[PDB]
Amino acid sequence: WTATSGSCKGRCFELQEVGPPDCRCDNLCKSYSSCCHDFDELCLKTARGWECTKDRCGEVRNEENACHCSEDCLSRGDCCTNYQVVCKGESHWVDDDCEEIKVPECPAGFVRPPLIIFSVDGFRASYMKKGSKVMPNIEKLRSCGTHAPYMRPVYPTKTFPNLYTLATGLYPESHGIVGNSMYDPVFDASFHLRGREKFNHRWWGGQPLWITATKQGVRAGTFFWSVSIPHERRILTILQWLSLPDNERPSVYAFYSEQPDFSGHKYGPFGPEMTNPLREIDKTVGQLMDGLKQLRLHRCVNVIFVGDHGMEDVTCDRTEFLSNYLTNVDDITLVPGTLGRIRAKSINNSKYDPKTIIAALTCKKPDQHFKPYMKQHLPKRLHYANNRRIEDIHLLVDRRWHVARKPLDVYKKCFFQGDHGFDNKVNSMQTVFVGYGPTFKYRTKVPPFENIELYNVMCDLLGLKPAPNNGTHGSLNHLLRTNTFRPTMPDEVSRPNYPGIMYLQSEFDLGCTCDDKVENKLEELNKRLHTKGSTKERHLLYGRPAVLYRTSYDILYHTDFESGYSEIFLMPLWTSYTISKQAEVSSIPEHLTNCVRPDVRVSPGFSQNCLAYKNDKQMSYGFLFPPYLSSSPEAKYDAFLVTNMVPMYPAFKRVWAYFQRVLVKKYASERNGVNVISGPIFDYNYDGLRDTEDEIKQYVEGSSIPVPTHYYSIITSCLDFTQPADKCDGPLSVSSFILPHRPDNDESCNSSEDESKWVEELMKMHTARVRDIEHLTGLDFYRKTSRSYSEILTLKTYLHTYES
Ligand SMILES: *[C@@H]1O[C@H](CO)[C@@H](O[C@@H]2O[C@H](CO)[C@@H](O[C@H]3O[C@H](CO[C@H]4O[C@H](CO)[C@@H](O)[C@H](O[C@H]5O[C@H](CO)[C@@H](O)[C@H](O)[C@@H]5O[C@H]5O[C@H](CO)[C@@H](O)[C@H](O)[C@@H]5O)[C@@H]4O)[C@@H](O)[C@H](O[C@H]4O[C@H](CO)[C@@H](O)[C@H](O)[C@@H]4O[C@H]4O[C@H](CO)[C@@H](O)[C@H](O)[C@@H]4O)[C@@H]3O)[C@H](O)[C@H]2NC(C)=O)[C@H](O)[C@H]1NC(C)=O
Ligand SMILES: O=C1N=C(N2CCCC2)S/C1=C\c1ccc(Oc2ccccc2)cc1
Ligand SMILES: [Ca+2]
Ligand SMILES: [Cl-]
Ligand SMILES: [K+]
Ligand code: NA
Ligand SMILES: [Zn+2]
């Protein structure tokens, strides 16, 4: 109930919302059906429009007008944004040459540069270049401030997940808004774009920027606007707030535009009807910048022009129907569209089975435009598993396509030409970032970054301590002139052991055999030097990874590779080796095909054994350092040590052997050498974090050898590829992957063909940031380089996307 008999007199767009049943006058009262009876009359005036004309100059103040051109309006802070241009001979902001803002130039009483966020829905990244002719204001912000070629949204590339990710710095699995439509089984409640459940605060996790500011004494304007409030009124409200007295004036604000997303759905991303929405966005930006100039704030405020996601060409005829795949269509609930989420229609149905659903959706049609996943098998870069609102069964839908349950859902629920929601590495889903102001850099282009990183920067801009989030604080320091956050490397928690030769061969009973008894002072001092680390500078280029948790492990040196061997997990946590451009690929000699050798540096009790692999009919093994890349026949025996062995399904060994035999050499040729760090990952609860020992759900049969869920590799080289990987003087270049360790290749529909037709495609889909691997392993890489730590943090957040 709301007693709407109160009045908004003197309360238009008040900043604290008053509790029911007293009537509200804030910018969200419409959305709650709770405004006072006179809100429209007093707070949403429209008379005479939004622009001063020559004849309105010096007028007598008429309070009925939407904005004012009278002489007192600057003091009252309610001029039309073009007042000084029309009435006082001033120029529009966009017509001024841009001049470097070296220091904040603020009116007295401003304690910090205000932050104004200008967020645009569906602003695809290529609009900045393709629409530049009709967006002069936005183009001046872009070219004179700091900008990225594009900003990567989060998956799913929907509106609410990405807006709340921007506000919190969290993956949607963590902040809880995992789609535009959700069902929460603990609540037994459903979240929808239309309706009032979405207003319930239990859906919204984390701590968004406006809460972080408020709790630390930084006042915030209210970020959200009821849809019927026109853009001109939102701009005027923000400008009016900026004229408030110092003790009442907010320091952070947000404007939101439902365009160009609204038209993009109707006409497609580049339909001829899209030019006018782009013009109107720019005009609104011009009004804000003109308004800031009037208030003498255009060289004081930091402005962020940021989008939530892009837009793709999608039509009704490009729809896949689950009725063409499933017999039991009526027993599932499908969350449809640019992604698919499937669950049982009724929890009292125990004839429901996800295994048969997935199989019926797997590689069933030659041109199939979606791929089913159990959510824990989705690429780890999507970080879309660890929430009860994310259904076990997920469909990754091809760009430009939709998935629906039945054909009647599409014509009884074409009427659209654009949509979004696809995989967040898709080019059409990318969106924009521009930073403009005293704290941002001048005329600076920064590399693409992910929108999860913005929350830290916005906290930096306001002097706030960020709540715990998924950005890497300091990775965007290169965007800022000042206010940078200078992080320290995390301290290493576990220091390694350096075992020498401590065990005789006969102490081992592992069931392993190797034909290695075929057998100097020349190359016997040499092999001693290698086992003591004499080639470690070549294969450990950036220092040893730091172990950031309490564990027991050994450093093992070899001619061709170095490893950190875990005595808890009975396998390396990491294996590091350098492959130069000139390195040659050899084969595994016939007599060494099944060779596995005890490591006389590591006790039998802390070693794997070959008998377990023999007895386990499902599990084979592979090697982290590849025997194919041994530098010499004698060095190849090191690659068969029991301490270099990891459990692998035979189906995965197809992938791994092709990567080790073919791709590493190809990358070394293309990048002028590469350094490779490979290892296992255990994430059985799919939370993105390293599993403790008591969370492992599968072992090699009859043993304590834990089975990894994933295998990673970090492949580093010199950004200036005229320099070899091991003699690099400047910035580095990296690509990484987190390959799921699966007993089948059902994910790859062409896997019965040669590995040259499908393996690299699979690896590209599971590309990863170094930072993702750090979360999954508890390791810290790149500890010893010549580069600044902030640059290294940027490198760790880089994602090689393989888009064009
Ligand atoms: C991205 O960044 C985020 C943020 O840093 C990070 O997420 C954090 O991960 C932490 C480790 O997993 C986790 O730590 C403790 O969580 C609870 C307390 O959490 C509550 O308090 C915080 C602080 O305000 C809230 O933010 C949090 O909100 C969560 O839950 C709400 C719904 O309940 C929801 O609004 C919100 O979205 C958020 O949900 C998300 O996180 C939860 C997990 O908290 C998931 O379940 C959701 O799916 C969603 O993803 C909560 O309100 C502590 O109680 C934990 O302590 C455990 O474990 C300890 C292990 O050392 C142990 O010492 C304790 O005894 C305790 O165990 C108890 O519970 C066990 C399991 O229930 C039980 O077996 C045992 O017997 C015992 O009873 C954690 O120490 C943070 O909460 C979490 N924060 C957020 C905001 O998510 C992400 O990890 C990264 N992502 C990546 C990839 O890096
Ligand atoms: O007024 C609004 N109407 C909205 N709608 C959603 C679809 C239907 C109407 S969202 C909205 C405002 C809003 C402003 C800022 C937000 O957080 C950010 C964004 C960028 C950077 C930092 C923080 C989040 C939301
Ligand atoms: Ca885990
Ligand atoms: Cl959704
Ligand atoms: K086996
Ligand atoms: Na297959
Ligand atoms: Zn949309």
Curated annotation (Swiss-Prot):
<keyword id="KW-0862">Zinc</keyword>
<feature type="binding site">
    <location>
        <position position="261"/>
    </location>
    <ligand>
        <name>1-tetradecanoyl-sn-glycerol 3-phosphate</name>
    </ligand>
</feature>
<feature type="binding site">
    <location>
        <position position="159"/>
    </location>
    <ligand>
        <name>1-(9Z-octadecenoyl)-sn-glycero-3-phosphate</name>
    </ligand>
</feature>
<dbReference type="GO" id="GO:0006644">
    <property type="term" value="P:phospholipid metabolic process"/>
</dbReference>
<keyword id="KW-0106">Calcium</keyword>
<dbReference type="GO" id="GO:1903165">
    <property type="term" value="P:response to polycyclic arene"/>
</dbReference>
<dbReference type="GO" id="GO:0003676">
    <property type="term" value="F:nucleic acid binding"/>
</dbReference>
<dbReference type="GO" id="GO:0008284">
    <property type="term" value="P:positive regulation of cell population proliferation"/>
</dbReference>
<feature type="binding site">
    <location>
        <position position="159"/>
    </location>
    <ligand>
        <name>Zn(2+) 1</name>
    </ligand>
</feature>
<dbReference type="GO" id="GO:0006955">
    <property type="term" value="P:immune response"/>
</dbReference>
<feature type="domain" description="SMB 2">
    <location>
        <begin position="48"/>
        <end position="92"/>
    </location>
</feature>
<dbReference type="GO" id="GO:0008270">
    <property type="term" value="F:zinc ion binding"/>
</dbReference>
<dbReference type="GO" id="GO:0016020">
    <property type="term" value="C:membrane"/>
</dbReference>
<keyword id="KW-0165">Cleavage on pair of basic residues</keyword>
<feature type="disulfide bond">
    <location>
        <begin position="363"/>
        <end position="749"/>
    </location>
</feature>
<comment type="function">
    <text>Secreted lysophospholipase D that hydrolyzes lysophospholipids to produce the signaling molecule lysophosphatidic acid (LPA) in extracellular fluids. Its major substrate is lysophosphatidylcholine. Can also act on sphingosylphosphorylcholine producing sphingosine-1-phosphate, a modulator of cell motility. Can hydrolyze, in vitro, bis-pNPP, to some extent pNP-TMP, and barely ATP. Involved in several motility-related processes such as angiogenesis and neurite outgrowth. Acts as an angiogenic factor by stimulating migration of smooth muscle cells and microtubule formation.</text>
</comment>
<feature type="glycosylation site" description="N-linked (GlcNAc...) asparagine">
    <location>
        <position position="360"/>
    </location>
</feature>
<feature type="binding site">
    <location>
        <position position="420"/>
    </location>
    <ligand>
        <name>1-(9Z-octadecenoyl)-sn-glycero-3-phosphate</name>
    </ligand>
</feature>
<feature type="binding site">
    <location>
        <position position="261"/>
    </location>
    <ligand>
        <name>Zn(2+) 2</name>
    </ligand>
</feature>
<feature type="binding site">
    <location>
        <position position="420"/>
    </location>
    <ligand>
        <name>1-hexadecanoyl-sn-glycero-3-phosphate</name>
    </ligand>
</feature>
<dbReference type="GO" id="GO:0004528">
    <property type="term" value="F:phosphodiesterase I activity"/>
</dbReference>
<dbReference type="GO" id="GO:0034638">
    <property type="term" value="P:phosphatidylcholine catabolic process"/>
</dbReference>
<dbReference type="GO" id="GO:0060326">
    <property type="term" value="P:cell chemotaxis"/>
</dbReference>
<feature type="glycosylation site" description="N-linked (GlcNAc...) asparagine">
    <location>
        <position position="470"/>
    </location>
</feature>
<feature type="disulfide bond">
    <location>
        <begin position="512"/>
        <end position="610"/>
    </location>
</feature>
<keyword id="KW-0442">Lipid degradation</keyword>
<feature type="binding site">
    <location>
        <position position="180"/>
    </location>
    <ligand>
        <name>1-hexadecanoyl-sn-glycero-3-phosphate</name>
    </ligand>
</feature>
<feature type="glycosylation site" description="N-linked (GlcNAc...) asparagine">
    <location>
        <position position="348"/>
    </location>
</feature>
<dbReference type="GO" id="GO:0004630">
    <property type="term" value="F:phospholipase D activity"/>
</dbReference>
<dbReference type="GO" id="GO:0051894">
    <property type="term" value="P:positive regulation of focal adhesion assembly"/>
</dbReference>
<feature type="active site" description="Nucleophile">
    <location>
        <position position="159"/>
    </location>
</feature>
<feature type="binding site">
    <location>
        <position position="308"/>
    </location>
    <ligand>
        <name>Zn(2+) 1</name>
    </ligand>
</feature>
<dbReference type="GO" id="GO:0047391">
    <property type="term" value="F:alkylglycerophosphoethanolamine phosphodiesterase activity"/>
</dbReference>
<dbReference type="GO" id="GO:0044849">
    <property type="term" value="P:estrous cycle"/>
</dbReference>
<feature type="region of interest" description="Phosphodiesterase">
    <location>
        <begin position="94"/>
        <end position="447"/>
    </location>
</feature>
<dbReference type="GO" id="GO:0005044">
    <property type="term" value="F:scavenger receptor activity"/>
</dbReference>
<feature type="disulfide bond">
    <location>
        <begin position="106"/>
        <end position="300"/>
    </location>
</feature>
<feature type="disulfide bond">
    <location>
        <begin position="98"/>
        <end position="144"/>
    </location>
</feature>
<dbReference type="InterPro" id="IPR002591">
    <property type="entry name" value="Phosphodiest/P_Trfase"/>
</dbReference>
<feature type="binding site">
    <location>
        <position position="420"/>
    </location>
    <ligand>
        <name>Zn(2+) 2</name>
    </ligand>
</feature>
<feature type="disulfide bond">
    <location>
        <begin position="73"/>
        <end position="79"/>
    </location>
</feature>
<dbReference type="GO" id="GO:0005615">
    <property type="term" value="C:extracellular space"/>
</dbReference>
